[PDB]
A and B are shown apart, each in its own frame.
Chain A
Amino acid sequence: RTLDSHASRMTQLKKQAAL
């Protein structure tokens, strides 16, 4: 769950394995 804020959405950015 993210809020409607820039600071919140910036938590959506994590590293991702392939496939």
Chain B
Amino acid sequence: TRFTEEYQLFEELGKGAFSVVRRCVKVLAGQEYAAKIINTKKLSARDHQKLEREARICRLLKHPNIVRLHDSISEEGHHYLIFDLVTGGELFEDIVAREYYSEADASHCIQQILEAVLHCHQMGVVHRNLKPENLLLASKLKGAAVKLADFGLAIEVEGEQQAWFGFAGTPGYLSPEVLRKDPYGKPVDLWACGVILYILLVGYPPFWDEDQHRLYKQIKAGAYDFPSPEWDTVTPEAKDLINKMLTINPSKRITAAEALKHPWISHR
């Protein structure tokens, strides 16, 4: 079709499983974009459809904290998803690099994420795979803008209707309700936001074990705490939000909207 007509590729930015992301420019506009190139030829049509579903969802979502999709193109043997360019690498990488975030930075960061989650939810979309690996930083500076990525596992809900949408996500960040093979919805993303905030503050996750069966027994039982010395200095407000995010029953758990009104996010 018309991709190698309008854009021109430069350096590789990352490999995925089936994919390769590369900085590209729209040659008429002179506009930098990130281009995720996928192999049609290595993929059944069932999986062509799985991809055109990802693009459909990404284009309902115009938001300052969500990597916007500008175009989506089928050529012979390749597919091109044109995202906003984000040069500051994964949130994960920058957390490792800085060991942990200050409450002030962690708040500014989780706030932006919650905003993104809220917009997803009010547009009838649940991400089901929130983790710092799927959050790109605008730059590597200390209070940087964070946009949300990969809706490869994102689903469509009708209103607050819960349902069994299958067993999917990342084991660290899975909801009790999903492991328990109960029906679920928007709250699964707020559970993940719980995990991500915790990581953000002290540099490790509230649930971990090398043996996955134990990791799951941990999550189901709401088995997190705030160890010493490092959590002793951290405000009780910060703790409170995490406690309302890692509430084990999903109906008593805090919503994206409730979360954005919490003192620890909206103070002064």
**Chain A residues at the B interface, C-beta cutoff of 8 Å:** 4, 6, 9-13, 15-19
Residue of A nearest to B17 (CB): A17
**Docked complex Cα distance between A7 and B145 (Å):** 28
Which residues of B pack against A, CB within 8 Å? 92, 95-96, 99-100, 129, 131, 133, 153, 168-173, 199, 202-205, 208, 227, 229-230
- Inter-subunit contact B202/A9 (CB<8 Å): yes
What is the chain B residue whose CB lies nearest that of A15? B133
Contact check, A15 vs B92: say whether CB atoms are below 8 A apart.
yes
A9 shortest CB reach to chain B, Å: 4
With known contacts A10-B203, A10-B204, A16–B170 Cβ distance under 8 A: yes
A13 touches B203 (CB 8 A): yes
Report how far A6 CA is from B202 CA in the complex, Å.
8
Q: Do most interface residues of chain B lie in helix, strand or loop, or is the interface mixed?
A: loop
Alpha-carbon gap, A17 to B16, bound state (A)? 11
- A18/B129 contact (C-beta < 8 A), A6-B229, A6-B230 known: yes
- 10 pairs of residues in contact across A and B, judged by CB atoms under 8 Å: A4-B227, A6-B203, A9-B204, A10-B99, A10-B202, A11-B204, A16-B172, A17-B170, A18-B169, A19-B168
Quick one: which of A12, A16, A19 contacts B131, CB cutoff 8 A? Answer: A16
Interface SS majority for chain A:
loop
In the complex, residue of chain B having the shortest beta-carbon distance to the beta carbon of A6: B230
Chain A residues, Cβ within 8 Å of B168 = 18-19
Known: A6-B229, A10-B99, A13-B199. A18 touches B205 (CB 8 A): no
Instruction: Tell me if B208 and A18 are in contact (CB < 8 A).
Output: no
Query: Can you name 14 extra interface pairs (CB under 8 A) apart from A12-B208, A15-B92?
Result: A6-B203, A6-B229, A9-B204, A9-B227, A10-B99, A10-B100, A12-B205, A13-B199, A13-B204, A15-B133, A16-B133, A16-B171, A16-B173, A18-B168
Contact A12 B170 (CB under 8 A): no
How far in angstroms is the closest Cβ of chain B from A11?
8
Q: Which residues from B are CB-within-8-Å of A18? A: 129, 153, 168-170
Q: How far is the CB of A4 from chain B (nearest CB, A)?
A: 8
> What separation, in Å, do the CA atoms of A16 and B210 have in the docked complex?
12
Question: What are the residues of chain B within 8 A of A15 when measuring CB–CB?
Answer: 92, 133
**Which chain A positions have C-beta within 8 A of B202?**
6, 9-10
Could you tell me the distance between the alpha carbons of A19 and B80 in the complex, rounded to whole angstroms? 25
- What is the CB-to-nearest-CB distance from A8 to chain B, in angstroms, rounded to a whole number? 9
With a cutoff of 8 Å between Cβ atoms, the chain B residues found around residue A6 in the complex are 202-203, 227, 229-230
Nearest chain B CB to A7 CB, angstrom units? 9
Contacts of B100 in A (CB 8 A): 10
B96 touches A13 (CB 8 A): yes
Q: CA separation between A6 and B201, bound complex, in Å?
A: 12
